[PDB]
Design a protein around this ligand. Structure first.
Ligand code: 3CS
Ligand code: 3CS
Ligand code: 3CS
Lengths: 148, 149, 140
């Protein structure tokens, strides 16, 4: 990748690598519970600390794709820096969500969803440029300067 | 993103944005179930509609990646319009599947497959340009005006 | 896609197409168990052969995203080949893992963590160029 382009994406790469790392921790806190006992042959059903964890993780796993989607499409189709930061904030809400899904009873982060607004915004940033592009395509050109 | 390039991808972006929205609906019809499922937290096995819902949705979740894969690779390596439409059609089959899952509790429908030929095609388009490239790489530069004596 | 660029990604595309195919196989060996025994909703402890399969598969399904992530970012921020080969190696570990999660009466191979170093490496490749870029940005 030519140093130039690499610039207009760096942040997105960064934030992505971050989520990639955090993504591992989530998948790590799940290994622990699998370990805490019978886990020998990674059984999915140890209850409690394992069920609450696998759930919390298997919830953020279903988000990642759809998140990354907006994350990049928004940052490319328009802005980047804003998209890049929004994506960072997501990483935090994700943390707070995953964490809040710990246990100790009580309706623990019952929500399957979470980011919402964050991806909603990222989606708009994408639906933004996606449209503004269609302009620069018609009225962006046109501008016939028949300088006869 | 230079207005030019943005063009040869717009549809892909569009279709993707679509799937992204629909994707939310899927994860929303799942939130309703855990809600109506009067209880505290959120668990993998509850009730009938919830069980059926989470399954349906958690089936399309395993799809998206492998689908987005071909969607783009097909749209980049071989014509963006045909790729974009394929993915579009795919979004529809998805709807019909997700909807048909648990809505009828009938003996047609279930499965963890959904659109097969839709991604197969997308795959081919990728395996298409991917090969035709090796021609442009190898032969695409071969001309015998060098036999010119 | 201009022939030039297509070059600096073909490997990634290829390997990606592979994992996409293998990805189908995994989801296929899951179809085999489901259709025989019953289950319109596959969320409860299924027949062993089926429970083992869906778990194995629904285990690589959580990987793919985070994998593809490093696969590309590493193959882009850091040169093509190695990143590509890395991902290729991963596809193999995947196979062995998924396969090792098959059997019957065998000590099944757990730790949903599969290919720790593989993606660790790919991650570094990314964190690599990601930094080296900041240099060329300042000290160029
Ligand atoms: C990220 C890294 C730089 C490449 C290092 C890395 O190699 C990975 C690590 C770090 C750790 C402890 C294994 C290590 O390097 O020592 N863990 C555990 C960890 C420990 C502390 C912290 I804070 C965060 C994570 C990983 C866990 C998973 C992983 O990929 C594979 C993988 C497979 C399935 C996944 C499912 C859901 C979701 C993700 C899934 N991922 C790589 C690593
Ligand atoms: C899509 C949008 C334009 C960015 C708006 C948006 O921000 C989200 C919406 C729409 C919303 C909030 C305005 C609403 O519910 O009314 N819902 C609920 C909704 C309502 C109507 C319809 I038709 C479809 C979905 C969302 C649900 C989830 C979401 O992200 C996070 C998320 C987390 C996990 C996911 C797992 C699988 C799959 C996806 C996962 N997503 C964003 C939104
Ligand atoms: C060219 C192509 C990309 C392989 C497309 C394709 O054609 C698909 C195939 C192969 C096929 C059509 C010859 C078949 O046997 O049915 N199968 C079954 C198969 C047969 C032999 C072997 I080895 C491997 C898989 C598919 C199964 C699912 C599929 O949708 C994508 C998909 C769907 C659900 C998934 C769930 C989890 C995780 C990933 C998921 N992915 C496409 C195909």
């Amino acid at each position: 990748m030519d140093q130039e382009t690499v610039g207009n994406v760096v942040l997105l790469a960064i934030v992505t690598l971050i989520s990639v790392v955090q993504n591992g921790f989530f998948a790590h806190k799940v290994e622990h519970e699998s370990r805490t006992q019978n886990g020998r042959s990674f059984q999915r059903t140890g209850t409690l600390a394992f069920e609450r964890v696998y759930t919390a993780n298997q919830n953020c796993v279903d988000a990642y794709p759809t998140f990354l989607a907006v994350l990049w499409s928004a940052g490319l189709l328009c802005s980047q820096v804003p998209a890049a930061f929004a994506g960072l904030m997501y990483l935090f809400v994700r943390q707070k969500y995953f964490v809040g899904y710990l246990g100790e009873r009580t309706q623990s982060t019952p929500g399957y969803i979470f980011g919402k607004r964050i991806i909603l915004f990222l989606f708009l940033m994408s639906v933004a440029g996606i449209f503004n592009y269609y302009l620069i395509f018609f009225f962006g050109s046109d501008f016939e300067n028949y300088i006869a």
